A paper describes a structure:
SUFU is an essential intracellular negative regulator of mammalian Hedgehog signalling and acts by binding and modulating the activity of GLI transcription factors. Here, the crystal and small-angle X-ray scattering structures of full-length human SUFU and its complex with the key SYGHL motif conserved in all GLIs are reported.
Although the crystallized protein was intact, both SUFU molecules in the orthorhombic asymmetric unit show no apparent density for the C-terminal domain residues 279–360, suggesting that this region of the molecule is highly mobile. Since disorder often impacts crystal diffraction quality, we generated a new construct (MBP-SUFU-Δ) in which these 82 residues were replaced with a shorter seven-residue loop. This construct was expressed and purified in the same way as MBP-SUFU-FL and crystallized both in the presence (crystal form I) and absence (crystal form II) of maltose. The fold of MBP-SUFU-Δ is essentially the same as for the full-length protein, demonstrating that the disordered residues are not critical for protein folding or overall stability. Collectively, these results imply that the IDR in SUFU is dispensable for GLI binding and repression activity in cells without upstream pathway activation.
Author numbering: 3 to 615, 626 to 713, 722 to 742
């Protein structure tokens, strides 16, 4: 925000210019500059940035969002003298009251209406069922019957609710968030009807707000569906239009979700009193509302005085008839999640991606899945561009006996950063490792503190190939494999961990057959009522790189991968095509690993190797035998472990034999400085004092190799071992 200046956000389809004129008058009378912006996806931007401390002093939007905003603590409480509260209709105040407090100034009442071309269609239909036949009549003379935005569920909700659909059941003043009604026969009936319209080529699933508006206003289609804001543009057009009641479906009224355009004050705003002055004494006046209304009609206003003038307009009348027949939107926080569920359901059902029953079943479950929704939020923040990415769904859900524990795996196109030389890739995000539903169907509920589910979800970044229109799906199957491992082992992962796989990740001949895990570079962790969720990105590595990771640590090797862009880069993007290890690409990298093992120690506690040396015996002489391969690890054993007071264990692949190098100062060994070499059966422990260890290392500064010291002998060999 800012002090002495007023920043306002309002959607671009509203009358921002009129509002700007009111801002001009305010700037004249008070000297405070009033800036009016209309960013895309503002409502979302607003929750997103309000916390950091950027944001609008005032935010305009339908009330349905505000309850959420208020629960997050983004909104200041508004305080009007009774003198002012009486100027507005009580029910508009109702729409903006949350948890007993007023959290926004109600501005206007928005409801969708059926807008029709009087020239093309003298008497509009009273029912949806006529439209198919009606379209056919018009198609005969190169026109269409109906076109409206199919991308926002706001416009198809009236039809869906008509025969029984609902968001949350309201009884006794309480909305039951668990009782969602988008899955019932009614909702199925309306959405099935829309889908059938598209099947019989009376509508097109691609159609959006702008195509619908252009079509109707140019006079290409007979009808459209929209709110009062739209009219101004139609007035400019050649079309003579009427605004009327929406068509009935199966004998029942269409029930549009009525909104109440409201203005909220940012809790992080310095100028809150300036905001109150502007809204109460400048905007919410006959003069202010008229100013805005000339630009784009607001609908049925909340200011009694001005509304009395407006109510005469037959268009407003129709607006209020549709409004009455429909319901007013709830303002609870769960609305946003509901809207998202339905938006996906409609689009997928209309495009043929899914059936009506499957889409609505998914929307039904997802309307009340705070975890799935809290993740979808962050996904939405990263990809405001992509509302519905290709998404792999597990059709037999895990908690019904299904094999795949990941309910969903979303697949995004990431454009990368040209400035950072980061290539375009596909970004897979998984859903199911965390608590999505929080009703104990998969994961025990644990509360807000602590990890939701296993506390993380999996992500993956697959370098996009030349001409790849769509992301491949094999990474989802991979993610299902890992997910199963976690679910059966009950074993969590942390940034740095490695996964040994030893098969091409993509079931090709690729050299990438193992995985490392790191924090997703872009995905921020999220607060889920069911817990906190972090995002672990999978990074494909060669067998050599995995080995480096075991010998040193995961973290170091990931960074090495970041420096070699071809092998990952800053965001650690997996290229299944890669043919060389990072070490074949830059040998100085091996050097970096050796320095790390020296100064960090190594995470390798033991190896299965070709090698050789109940009562706890003691020995004064010891002769070890090693394969070249296990002989290679001796420096690691000493430099990497004993010099860090860490023990190391060779176990013979055949034998029951074992050799555990023990630093002076390790705990629980049966080897003492007094008696360094001791054995319990086939298991041998030898304790080396640090000085001797250093000496030994210098001595090791190819085959056969023999070493001797006063105490003990060491042999390096090739085929004595079977
Ligand atoms: O698409 C779902 C959407 O519906 C409503 O958004 C309306 C808004 O109320 C109107 O003022 C106008 O801008 O049309 C919007 C839809 O394009 C809800 O208010 C919103 O929360 C929801 O996302």
């Amino acid at each position: 925000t800012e002090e002495g200046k007023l920043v306002i956000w309002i959607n671009g389809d509203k009358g921002y210019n009129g509002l700007a004129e009111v801002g001009k008058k305010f700037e004249k009378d008070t000297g405070i500059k009033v800036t009016v912006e209309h960013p895309d996806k503002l409502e979302e931007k607003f929750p997103q940035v309000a916390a950091t401390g950027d944001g609008p002093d005032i935010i305009f939007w339908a009330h349905d969002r505000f309850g959420g905003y208020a629960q997050s603590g983004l909104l200041a409480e508004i305080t009007p003298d009774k003198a002012f509260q009486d100027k507005l209709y009580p029910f508009t105040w109702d729409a903006v009251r949350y948890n007993g407090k007023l959290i926004a100034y109600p501005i206007a009442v928005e409801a969708l209406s059926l807008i029709y071309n009087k020239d093309l269609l003298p008497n509009p239909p009273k029912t949806w069922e006529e439209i198919p036949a009606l379209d056919k009549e018009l198609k005969a003379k190169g026109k269409s019957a109906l076109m409206f935005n199919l991308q926002e569920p706001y416009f198809t909700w009236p039809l869906i609710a008509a025969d029984g659909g609902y968001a949350f059941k309201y009884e006794n003043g309480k909305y039951d968030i668990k009782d969602v009604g988008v899955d019932n026969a009614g909702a199925k009936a309306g959405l099935t009807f829309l889908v059938d319209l598209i099947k019989n080529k009376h509508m097109n699933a691609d159609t959006d707000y702008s195509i619908a508006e252009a079509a109707f206003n140019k006079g290409e289609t007979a009808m459209t569906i929209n709110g009062p804001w739209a009219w101004s543009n139609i007035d400019t057009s050649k079309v003579n239009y009427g605004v009327t009641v929406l068509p009935t479906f199966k004998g029942q009224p269409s029930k549009p979700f009525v909104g109440v355009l409201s203005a909220g004050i940012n809790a992080a705003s310095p100028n809150k009193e300036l905001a109150k002055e502007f809204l109460e004494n400048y905007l919410l006046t006959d003069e202010g509302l008229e100013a805005v209304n000339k630009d784009k009609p607001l609908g049925a206003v909340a200011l009694k005085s001005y509304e009395e003038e407006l109510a005469k307009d037959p268009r407003i009348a129709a607006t209020m008839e549709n409004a009455q027949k429909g319901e007013i939107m709830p303002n609870i926080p769960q609305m946003s999640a509901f809207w998202y569920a339905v938006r996906t359901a409609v689009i997928n059902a209309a495009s043929g991606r899914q059936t009506v029953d499957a889409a609505l079943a998914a929307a039904q479950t997802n309307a009340a899945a705070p975890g799935l929704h809290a993740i979808y939020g962050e996904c939405r923040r990263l990809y405001p561009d992509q509302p519905n990415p290709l998404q792999v769904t597990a059709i037999v859900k895990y908690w019904l006996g299904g094999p795949d524990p990941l309910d969903y795996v979303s697949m995004y196109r990431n454009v990368g950063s040209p400035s950072a030389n980061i290539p375009e890739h596909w970004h897979y995000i998984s859903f199911g490792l965390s608590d999505l539903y929080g009703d104990n169907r998969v994961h025990e509920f644990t509360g807000t503190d602590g990890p939701s589910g296993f506390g993380f979800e999996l992500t993956f970044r697959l370098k996009r190939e030349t001409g790849e229109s769509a992301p491949p799906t094999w990474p989802a199957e991979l993610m299902q494999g890992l997910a199963r491992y976690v679910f059966q082992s009950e074993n969590t992962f942390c940034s740095g961990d490695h996964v040994s796989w030893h098969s091409p990740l993509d079931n090709s001949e690729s050299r990438i057959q193992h995985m490392l895990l790191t924090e997703d570079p872009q995905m921020q962790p999220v607060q889920t009522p069911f817990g906190v969720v972090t995002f672990l990105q999978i990074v494909g590595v060669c067998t050599e790189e995995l080995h480096s990771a075991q010998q040193w640590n995961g973290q170091g090797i990931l960074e090495l991968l970041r420096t070699v862009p071809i092998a990952g880069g800053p965001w650690l993007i997996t290229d299944m095509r890669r043919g060389e290890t990072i070490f074949e690409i830059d040998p100085h990298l091996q050097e970096r690993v050796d320095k790390g093992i020296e100064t960090d120690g190594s995470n390798l506690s033991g190896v299965s190797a070709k090698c050789a040396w109940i009562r706890t015996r003691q020995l004064e002489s010891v002769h070890l035998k090693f394969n070249q391969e296990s002989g290679a690890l001796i420096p690691l054993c000493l430099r990497g472990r004993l010099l860090h007071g860490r023990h190391f264990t060779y176990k013979s692949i055949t034998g029951d034999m074992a050799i555990t190098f023990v630093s002076t100062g390790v705990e629980g060994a049966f080897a003492t400085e007094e008696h360094p070499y001791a054995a319990h059966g086939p298991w041998l422990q030898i304790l080396l004092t640090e000085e001797f260890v250093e000496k030994m290392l210098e001595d090791l500064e190819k085959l056969p190799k023999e070493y001797s010291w006063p105490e003990k002998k060491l042999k390096v060999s090739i085929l004595p071992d079977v």
